[PDB]
Amino acid sequence: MYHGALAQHLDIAQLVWYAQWLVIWTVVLLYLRREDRREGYPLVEPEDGQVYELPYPKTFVLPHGGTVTVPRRRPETRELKLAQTDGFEGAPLQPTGNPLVDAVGPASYAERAEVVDATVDGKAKIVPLRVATDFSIAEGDVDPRGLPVVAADGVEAGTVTDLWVDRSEHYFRYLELSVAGSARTALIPLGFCDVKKDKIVVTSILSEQFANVPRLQSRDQITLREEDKVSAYYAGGLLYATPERAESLL
């Protein structure tokens, strides 16, 4: 006789093979793929399948008050300055105006909360060093304050005046500069800055395009939606800073 042998010439490992696949597909399809649909659903083009593919809503209790429930209905009724290039359903859209100012394509921001991101103790998380006075630049690294910002056309776009630090993670996230000839201040994410000893090089936008970088409501704090608006404007320049950039690279 044999250990594991069952009737009908079945054996135990053979049964566990079918059971393991049942467990894997149940977790992948009924649990994980439904967790994948807590954002962006229902899709836009009420069918039974739109209900079957969603998980039951979950509610996050937020650390500084209030709650967030997902999935929930989030229609984007914001007017998009875009037109169809063709009647085909999968045809791309094209900007009808200035896509950086209109915030479409890679210049799009998300409708995040107009709330200042907070530290664990409830203070503004992302703030300039003129406010975060116990924070400093590490010895050995460039102090960019006073350096020129040189844009993708090689023209000086302005002068760096401060750094915005993340007080929760001990990490700089933006530079702030005065925009040359435009009587205004602007933030730029440090991921768009090539920090050199004598200049900050920015290849995402041309010098003239710094004039329309999204402006903050307040001088020493920034909201989550404003961070999205500022970051998206420079990302938009990767595709739109010149007419050539949207076209085939090769």
């Binding site: 006789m1 044999y2 250990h3 594991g4 042998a5 054996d11």
Partner: protein, 332 residues
Amino acid sequence: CFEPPPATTTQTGFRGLSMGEVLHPATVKAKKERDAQYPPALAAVKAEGPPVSQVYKNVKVLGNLTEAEFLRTMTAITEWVSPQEGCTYCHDENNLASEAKYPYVVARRMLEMTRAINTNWTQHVAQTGVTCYTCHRGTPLPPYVRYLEPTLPLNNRETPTHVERVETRSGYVVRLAKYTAYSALNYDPFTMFLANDKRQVRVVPQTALPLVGVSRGKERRPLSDAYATFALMMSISDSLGTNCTFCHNAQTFESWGKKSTPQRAIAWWGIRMVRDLNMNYLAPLNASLPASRLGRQGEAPQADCRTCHQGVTKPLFGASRLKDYPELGPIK
């Protein structure tokens, strides 16, 4: 640290299975040059006169040879076993019938063993056969022999370091490792599998499910057996200068038919041949050898695959003297 390309590769299994030899041309050349030192066959002599069983006083194995044929055998034996020492290694120069020197009676047993290999083990040595040279390579002590504990260097013509010496306890794990292709396997496959026929090399079940009555508790061979068979296989591989796929499709080490090469069956016959040589011809020589030749348990030096093969899949790359010295076998 590394071996410069190109590598020589052969195919020993169906295409797409990565089966075959992988060889470094400079190492193959160096081994062919060493093995090519095999002395040429001596000029043939016509059989004339009476058998030496009538002419000489103490001939017990080669008595059917005529005097010229027999003295040609003694010249070949001296070339193969004691060319530096000469005829007087085995003989009293004033009485060639005297057995007073110990190598004389050992040589007579070796003449019987060599004729037994070429007559009784053709399943292994085929019509290539062996002579005294296959093992001895021109010295009375063969360069690659085994005792009942691992010894270094593998080639006893090289001077040992203090830590290689069998008495230095701190060097034991290295003596074991250099006998199993540098593995850490904590088993001596010579004493376990080749000194005698007490153990089974096969360790893999021949059924998909565990048979009730052999698969629980003390019914089972301990997993140590599988490590020990792996150690034997590392040793055999290094002893023949080859790798597992010269004999096995590793898809199923335990299967024969299309899953093994013809060389694996010849290797199987070689395990039985080596056990016969050790149990019935070599181990019993501790009563005939001087104490200086014996290992620390009083054992005579014995043979493994390397004793003949010395790093090559056919000893001496297939060189033969079988037709040149028919007195060494096969014997009708």
